[PDB]
């Protein structure tokens with residue numbers, strides 16, 4: 299059958315929102331009130347992959363954009379990028395591995411581990427207005443925990 303998707307927003311555990319800041323660039327900042335319309339709405343697809351009670355493979359597309367978060371080696375390091383795709387072919391149930399995150403539920407929070415790069419996580423900085431990035435470190439001024447919000 300089709301692939302199933304939900305619209306949602308994400309906030310880091312310090313409650314910073316994610317907003318598109320220039321061509322292909324997600325940034326995390328503290329947001330409230332009018333400015334909350336700036337936040338990125340994801341289409342979270344439930345994709346093929348290794349699964350357990352608390353570990354669910356997803357893809358993170360930007361709502362009604364042919365753009366996905368992906369994990370690739372850049373200058374020899376696992377990095378997070380926004381990657382464009384053929385809008386005729388996405389989303390799909392069998393997403394390529396660079397697009398797949400293991401959504402892990404621990405203590406009422408979510409972590410997004412790269413399926414491609416074990417123990418590398420979607421991360422934010424403690425500082426305001428810095429890039430969302432892939433981090434291979436868990437607890438060291440890098441926020442790897444998020445809360446999920448379901449939107450209409």
Ligand SMILES: C1C[C@@H](CNC2CC2)CO1
Nearest residue numbers: 323324378379380429430
């Ligand atoms: C989405 C992917 C990431 C790209 N980082 C590179 C510095 C641009 C930031 O937002």
